């Protein structure tokens, strides 16, 4: 029942709603036909069924690695997706800004709980630019059609942590 | 690693015209799914394009032809029937439509005292496309800086160069968008004949003791009096009248800073308002002055 | 004869751990019939074909236990007759397909002293085990008798005090459920329960 | 090739304080005109400074001392009496005066739905100096971008970062001008408690056929309902009434999208208007909704 | 009675009024005590008394050389005079813009009258920056306390030209 | 005794070619008296001291002919007695010092058919030779008899039709002159001339 953990869960729930809404808004204007993938996004494979067992270090380590990759891709989109996708601002930019804060919010969490910090990992090389404006939009469905799973798994994962500390 | 693409990249077409879109699949993707041109399906804005409008040009490309375009914005998407149950997106393009800009008409400019030259023009039929308006201006042996219209107020610009009286300037506006470029007529004029001075201020009504049927008006003319000779219009009525009266224009055809209004009813309150403009009537009437009240002695 | 047509497949899930999918023949023309069922986890670990066991060993339904909650699964239902196949492939994500059952035990009670207040209470559905990670949000609707239009509120928890009940009139009340993180879809409406605000 | 200079270059001093200005002549100019310190005359804004206020510190420099500065802007000029008839300008400086900025008080921020965080504060006594206002904001382990106030609206800023609900943010304003720097109190708050949602729209009044004394209100809540639970205030009166009535707040303390108003007079027209805010009363009341009219069956 | 000559005279008369007004406005806010000089401005020495005799080539050649130097100095002021003199805008900038046009107006005049054009002269090296903000203002009195003599001598000189062609 | 005090010097010019300056003793204490007069053109050509000749050879006035119109001159009037000097130095620019004489021959006439119009006419002053380079601008003032406040107009040319004359009343009219390019200063007012608008 930490004071710090309730607040972080609230922002993930807040961010999850923004991401689901933006994904649905995006599909309304630029429909997607089919499951879109990007080789660079992480696989979020972990079963909620067998999710209780996983203790405190794994949830926080996994969220940071997954969320950091997603931040780069959202940030990447606002640079090169093409004029076709300018219509998702400012909603897409607000998501970028709030998502950046949540990654920051997680780093503060690790310091206050005095948990061993992961080693400064080597940043991933740059993503090639999209091959077309529509290629960036198709990439956009994949990037924030995935970002509402990482955040979804964060609310679920963080609620597990509250049950312990 | 897309499967293919649609060409042209992002076309803009004219309303009621024809448009043909071609979707081409890369060979590597075609091998992977074991498909060909006959399996391409087109969708737009969540609407399935009816199969009868498709045209297989070759096993690598499919095409559709739109006639009488009536949508301002058409989102076109190309999808493939890979297993024959699951639809996957190949490519997409945005079709924007509209009209070329109409030739600007009723082009006019105005020089408000203390401000830079401003020009206004009548835009024609709505074009539904982002249309840029650029004010072009040149004197005769050198062209001075351009005005790119702001999204707000698409019919007006305020130049970035200071107004220069007494020199003929050639001005025109060029309207251009993805479907066309057009220029207004090349009107030619001297800014000195397009001045809209500010109205006179410090207007005062004074009660002369002698001749209880006479009132003298005084005021300060606008600074623009240093370049042109001003003409004014003084209107007056009784404090209770509903309509304004007017001094004979011939009596006020040249620069002055005072005027004595006569044949007014004794010990009656009168309200005055004034405006001024260039002596030759070439230009624009200024706005109405501040209201003024007065009472005879 | 002719090869089988594609079978019609639907999946569902009323809880967060296991889900299940069902299928029906689209045509009763192939007399002998059998079903091949399988599924895989699409990537971007042998995630290949895993059998979908058929529960009372004859029904038109198989269940997948211990499914990955956030991953997407491609279910392969294949109709086979002595003459061919017409595999139906159906994409399913546990986070998308989920739909809880309506709340249970909905009761509506008057609120003494307040002629236009009612207290509504209800319980979780039995198919949803109460667990701290996945709550459910609830949506309550109430309508006075003989009136045509519903009013909607979004209660916190398992209770809701209605404050705009028409005085002296029976009220119908029904509720529906959805995963608290907006996963899946809203439940079907509960059976209506009736109550009447107290007098005074 | 000036003759000399005044120091300090361009001072700013506090009202009612003392200021000493020193004018120094270069040696080369002094030789040319055959003069010295006793010949320096000071002038300000066309006013000759009275000789009794001068102080010759040495033959190279003269000085004046101002007490109880009361002018917002003082133009000081130093001149020399070369031949004793002709005055020539040696140097000049501009003296600007004012007050240091007062500590901002009543600091408050507001998050209008769809817009970025905006903060307002009460400026204190006029300072007569160009005073910059900078909104400082930081969460706890990193400081985010600053708001430099615009000349227009000196008491407000609209941040350049998107609003982030559910995280406590430390905010304060620092006011600074040539005479001083000061900071507002370091208030601390969560933007979620400073939201001013837009008012409900699509408000509809409907005439139920049964129970001619009952009318049902429906409307669409503001998007901000996804983060906080809303509370509302519904006011109503008869089409001819002069004052508004109000539903008991206790009956409307939590999010909902409809309400049935009872005990209304039969076949009478009623006008409604609504506003909403966060359920705990922490924040700001929204603006009034669009007006709505209705008639019972 | 050339159509071209009347119009140019009108603009010089217009510009003269602006310059006199700006010089007087400037002296009102930043008084000057004494006659200010700059080594770089031209000496406008020519007597109106013995001014009739001078024919068409001299008036136009002299105005261009004098006015070109004055344009540079006005333009120079808007770059480096110091914040103290920012108060003379936008009036000072309008003078710069109109003065530039009049120099241009004179070059057009020479072409239309088919007069021999002066050789492209070597531009003068840069003026050192002012030693102080007030040094720039003192320089300003000299620059446009002189520019209302060149223009003054232009109206007078151009009226002589009208009397001939 | 004591050295002379600085003499008092004024200059003036009613035309654009020559100008003239005058000086008076500030004190009649130095009995024998004589004046040294000179002037130079300040630069930024022996522009040194040039004598200022005294016209009827005894008066307190010297004239400079063929002066540079735009240049600035520094006039040096020096009082000398057997005991010293007190040179007065006075800066003068022909473009600044100039002041024309008032217009001549001002006449005001009624305008038949218009009971509130008058036609004013006047001529150049004799000290200003009409020449195309230096016109004069004019400023006309008119005032009805017994009234205290003047009305001002700025006529083009040597004539002006007044349009706000009070009907049936004598009007006083006076005018002043200035160089048409705002050089120097406005003239003194002409002598008033009277006229009365026609009846009808
Ligand atoms: C969905 O599941 C069905 C059921 O397994 C899949 O059908 C299978 O398809 C493969 C071909 O890809 C068959 O392989 C066999 O290979 C041998 C050796 O050449 C040959 O003798 C057979 O005639 C056949 O080609 C396999 O037999 C068949 N399954 C069964 C039970 O017969 C189907 O491919 C799946 N759909 C997917 C993965 O999209
Ligand atoms: C204004 O004009 C007067 C009149 O000329 C100027 O007075 C002159 O001043 C000079 C000194 O600068 C005198 O020079 C003489 O030099 C000889 C040789 O040393 C010496 O014997 C004399 O006693 C005197 O110093 C000159 O005599 C004197 N003029 C006359 C007529 O005596 C005055 O300087 C001028 N003011 C200026 C230019 O500011
Ligand atoms: C199949 O048809 C498409 C139709 O576009 C062909 O693509 C064009 O190919 C020509 C080759 O001469 C190029 O010049 C064009 O630029 C191509 N246009 C597009 C939009 O692709 C394609 O080459 C055809 N393939 C075969 C094998 O005939
Ligand atoms: C005359 O007085 C002035 C007063 O300022 C002197 O100027 C100062 O000189 C000191 C020398 O120690 C410097 O440290 C200061 O920075 C100077 N200030 C200014 C404003 O000039 C000047 O040196 C004195 N001269 C003599 C010969 O005593
Ligand atoms: C295609 O274009 C032609 C000519 O522009 C037109 O006549 C025809 O109606 C259009 N549509 C078709 C052929 O479907
Ligand atoms: C309209 O003007 C903007 C501003 O520079 C420009 O970026 C855009 O390309 C213009 N649109 C055209 C030329 O169609
Ligand atoms: C100078 O300053 C002192 C102290 O600030 C003050 O008492 C005095 O009145 C001021 N003015 C003078 C000395 O003229
Ligand atoms: C006020 O802000 C402006 C904007 O950058 C800055 O240039 C100026 O120096 C500031 N004034 C101060 C710090 O006194």
Element containing residue B134 per DSSP (H, E): strand B132-138
Sign of CA dihedral F104, F110, F112, F116: positive
For residues A98 and A106, what is the distance between their CA atoms, to the nearest angstrom? Answer: 12
Q: Which residues contact E160 (CB under 8 A, 6 or more apart)?
A: E51, E52, E54, E59, F132, F133
Ligand 7 atom closest to the CA of D17, numbered from 1: 5
Residue B27 CA, ligand 3 centroid: distance in Å: 13
Nearest Cα to Cα of residue D97 among D180, D208, D34: D180
| Domain total of chain E | 1
Residues of chain A numbered 107-126 and touching chain C (CB < 8 Å)? none
Chain B contact probe: residue of F153, F163, F165, F170 with most B CBs at under 10 A: F163
Please give the angle made by the CA atoms of E41, E43 and E49, to the nearest 5 degrees.
150
**Phi and psi for D278 in degrees, rounded to 5?**
-55, 140
| Domain total of chain B | 3
Ligand 3 atom closest to the CA of B59, numbered from 1: 1
Q: Which residues contact F8 (CB under 8 A, 6 or more apart)?
A: F23, F24, F25, F26, F88
Residue B97 CA, ligand 3 centroid: distance in Å: 26
Ligand 4 binding pocket includes D20 (Cβ within 6 Å): no
Closest Cβ–Cβ partner in D208, D214, D252 for C163: D252
Residue A43 CA, ligand 2 centroid: distance in Å: 103
Q: Are strands B87-98 and B12-14 parallel, antiparallel or unpaired?
A: parallel
Q: Which parts of C89-172 fold into alpha helices (H)?
A: 94-97
Is the preceding omega at residue A90 within 30 degrees of 0, hence cis? yes
* Residues B118/B159, Cβ–Cβ less than 8 Å: yes
Residue range F104-195, CATH number: 2.60.40.10
Helices and strands, number each (H, E), in chain F? 1, 15
3-state SS class at D2: coil
Note down the domain range covering B127. 105-194
* Residues F43/E43, Cβ–Cβ less than 8 Å: yes
For residues A27 and A22, what is the distance between their CA atoms, to the nearest angstrom? Answer: 8
E13: alpha, beta or left? (left if phi > 0; alpha if psi -120 to 50): alpha
Helices and strands, number each (H, E), in chain E? 5, 0
Interhelix angle E91-112/E3-29, rounded to 10 degrees, is 160
C27: alpha, beta or left? (left if phi > 0; alpha if psi -120 to 50): beta
- Do both D206 and D244 map to the same domain? yes
Chain F contact for D85, CB < 8 A?
yes
Q: Which residues pair with B147 in a beta bridge?
A: B135
Q: Which residues pair with B63 in a beta bridge?
A: B22, B55
CB contact under 8 Å between D86 and F91, yes or no, is yes
Which residues of chain F lie closer than 8 angstroms to D83, CB-CB? Answer: 87, 89
Domain end: B98, B116, B146, which one? B98
* Residues F49/F38, Cβ–Cβ less than 8 Å: yes
Cα C3 to Cα C30, C37, D160, F42, distances in angstroms: 8, 18, 63, 115
Q: Which CATH number is F8-97's, of 1.10.10.10, 2.60.40.10, 3.40.470.10, 3.40.630.10?
A: 2.60.40.10
Closest Cβ–Cβ partner in E10, E97, E107 for B161: E97
Domain spans of chain C, in order of start: 8-97, 104-195
Which residues of chain F lie closer than 8 angstroms to B260, CB-CB? Answer: 144, 151, 164, 166
For residue E7, the domain's CATH number is 1.20.1250.10
For residue B209, the domain's CATH number is 2.60.40.10
* Chain C touching partners, 3 or more CB pairs below 8 A: A, B, D
Ligand 3 atom closest to the CA of B60, numbered from 1: 1
Cα D8 to Cα D44, D80, D179, distances in angstroms: 16, 19, 15
Written in H, E and C, the secondary structure of chain A is: CCHHHHHHHHHHHHHHHHHHHHHHHHHHHCCCCCCCCCCCCCCCCCCCHHHCCCCHHHHHHHHHHHHHHHHHHHHHHHHHCCHHHHHHCCHHHHHHHHHHHHHHHHHHHHHHCCCCCCCCCCCCCCCCCCCCHHHHHHHHHHHCCCHHHHHHHHHHHHHHHHCCC
Smallest-distance ligand from the CA of C78? 1
CB contact under 8 Å between E163 and F132, yes or no, is yes
Domain end: D194, D226, D260, which one? D194
* Residues C1/C45, Cβ–Cβ less than 8 Å: no
The token pair at D32 is: 């040319």
Q: Where are the beta strands (DSSP E) in E3-151?
A: none
Check for a shared fold between F8-97 and F104-195: yes
Ligand 2 binding pocket includes F87 (Cβ within 6 Å): yes
Note down the domain range covering A104. 1-165
Ligand 2 binding pocket includes F76 (Cβ within 6 Å): yes
Which residues of chain A lie closer than 8 angstroms to C17, CB-CB? Answer: 48-49
Domain end: B98, B130, B162, which one? B98
CB contact under 8 Å between F70 and E48, yes or no, is yes
Resolution in Å, one decimal place: 3.5
Ligand 4 atom closest to the CA of D59, numbered from 1: 1
Residues comprising chain A, all counted = 165
* F vs C contact (3+ beta-carbon pairs below 8 A): no
The token pair at D15 is: 């009202």
* Residues F117/F167, Cβ–Cβ less than 8 Å: no
Q: Are strands D214-220 and C171-179 parallel, antiparallel or unpaired?
A: unpaired
Look-up of token digits 């040096």: F76
Tell me the Cα Rg of chain C.
23
Smallest-distance ligand from the CA of C40? 1
Chain F contact for B211, CB < 8 A?
yes
Identify how the structure was determined.
cryo-EM
Smallest-distance ligand from the CA of F87? 2
- Do both D154 and D215 map to the same domain? no
* Residues F40/F47, Cβ–Cβ less than 8 Å: yes
The token pair at C16 is: 């967060």
Residue D59 CA, ligand 2 centroid: distance in Å: 28
CB contact under 8 Å between A29 and B86, yes or no, is no
Sign of CA dihedral A37, A43, A45, A48: negative
Residue B93 CA, ligand 3 centroid: distance in Å: 18
Q: Which residues contact E9 (CB under 8 A, 6 or more apart)?
A: E155, E158, E159, E162
Ligand 2 binding pocket includes F72 (Cβ within 6 Å): no
For residues A92 and C78, what is the distance between their CA atoms, to the nearest angstrom? Answer: 41
Sign of CA dihedral E26, E32, E37, E40: negative
Q: Which residues contact E138 (CB under 8 A, 6 or more apart)?
A: D2, D89, D92, E32, E36
The token pair at A48 is: 């909620």
């Amino acid at each position: 029942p930490r004071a710090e953990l309730d607040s972080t869960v609230l922002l993930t729930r807040s961010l999850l709603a923004d991401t689901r809404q933006l994904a649905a808004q995006l599909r309304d204007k630029f429909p997607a036909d089919g499951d879109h993938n990007l080789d660079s996004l992480p696989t979020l494979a972990m079963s909620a069924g067998a999710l209780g067992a996983l203790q405190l270090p794994g949830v926080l380590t996994r969220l940071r690695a997954d969320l950091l990759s997603y931040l780069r891709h959202v940030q990447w989109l606002r640079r090169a997706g093409g004029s076709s996708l300018k219509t998702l601002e400012p909603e897409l930019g607000t998501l970028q800004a709030r998502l950046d804060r949540l990654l920051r919010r997680l780093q503060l969490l690790m310091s206050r709980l005095a948990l061993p910090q992961p080693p400064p990992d080597p940043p991933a090389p740059p993503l090639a630019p999209p091959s077309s404006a529509w290629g960036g939009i198709r990439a956009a469905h994949a990037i924030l059609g995935g970002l509402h799973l990482t955040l979804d798994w964060a609310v679920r994962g963080l609620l597990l942590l509250k049950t312990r500390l | 690693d897309p499967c293919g693409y649609i060409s042209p990249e992002s076309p803009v077409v004219q309303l009621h015209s024809n448009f043909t879109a071609v979707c081409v699949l890369k060979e590597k993707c075609m091998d992977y799914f074991h498909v060909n041109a006959n399996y391409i399906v087109w969708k737009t804005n969540h609407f399935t394009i009816p199969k009868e409008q498709y045209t297989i040009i070759n096993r690598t490309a499919s095409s559709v032809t739109f006639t009488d375009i009536a949508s301002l914005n058409i989102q076109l998407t190309c999808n493939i029937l890979t297993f024959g149950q699951l639809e996957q997106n190949v490519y997409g393009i945005t079709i924007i439509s509209g009209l070329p800009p109409e030739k600007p008409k009723n082009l006019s400019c105005i020089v408000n005292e203390g401000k830079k030259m401003r020009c206004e023009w009548d835009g024609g039929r709505e074009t539904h496309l982002e249309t840029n308006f650029t004010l072009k201006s040149e004197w005769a042996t050198h062209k001075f800086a351009d005005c790119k219209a702001k999204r707000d107020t698409p019919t007006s610009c305020t130049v970035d160069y200071s107004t220069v009286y007494f020199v003929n300037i050639e001005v025109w506006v060029e309207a251009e968008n993805a479907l066309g470029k057009v220029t207004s007529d090349h009107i030619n004029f001297d800014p000195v004949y397009k001045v809209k001075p500010n109205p006179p201020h410090n207007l005062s009504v004074i009660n002369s003791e002698e001749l209880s049927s006479i009132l003298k008006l005084t005021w300060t003319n606008p600074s623009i009096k240093s370049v042109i000779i001003l003409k004014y219009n003084i209107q007056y009525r009784t404090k209770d009248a509903s309509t304004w009266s007017q001094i004979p224009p011939e009596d006020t055809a040249s620069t002055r800073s005072s005027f004595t209004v006569q044949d007014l009813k004794p010990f009656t309150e009168y309200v005055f308002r004034i405006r001024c403009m260039k002596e030759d009537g070439k230009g624009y009437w200024s706005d109405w002055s501040e209201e003024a009240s007065g009472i005879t002695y | 004869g002719y090869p089988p047509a594609r079978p019609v497949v639907s999946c569902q899930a009323a809880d967060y751990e296991n889900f299940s999918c069902t299928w029906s023949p689209s045509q009763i023309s192939g007399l002998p019939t059998r079903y091949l069922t399988s599924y895989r986890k699409k990537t971007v670990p042998s995630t290949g074909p895993w059998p979908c066991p058929q529960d009372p060993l004859g029904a038109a339904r198989c269940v997948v236990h211990g499914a990955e909650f956030w991953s997407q699964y491609r279910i392969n239902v294949t109709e086979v007759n002595p003459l061919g196949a017409s595999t139906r492939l159906l994409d399913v994500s546990l986070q998308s397909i989920l739909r809880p059952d309506p709340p249970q035990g909905l009761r509506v009670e008057s609120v003494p002293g307040y002629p236009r207040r009612l207290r509504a209470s209800w319980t979780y559905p039995a198919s949803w085990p109460s667990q701290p990670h996945f709550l459910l949000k609830f949506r309550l609707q109430y309508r006075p008798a003989q009136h045509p239009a519903w009013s909607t509120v979004e209660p916190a928890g398992l209770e809701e005090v209605i404050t705009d009940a028409v005085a002296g009139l029976p009220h119908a009340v029904r509720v529906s459920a959805r995963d608290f993180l907006d996963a899946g879809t809203w439940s079907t409406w509960s059976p209506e329960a009736w109550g009447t605000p107290s007098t005074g």
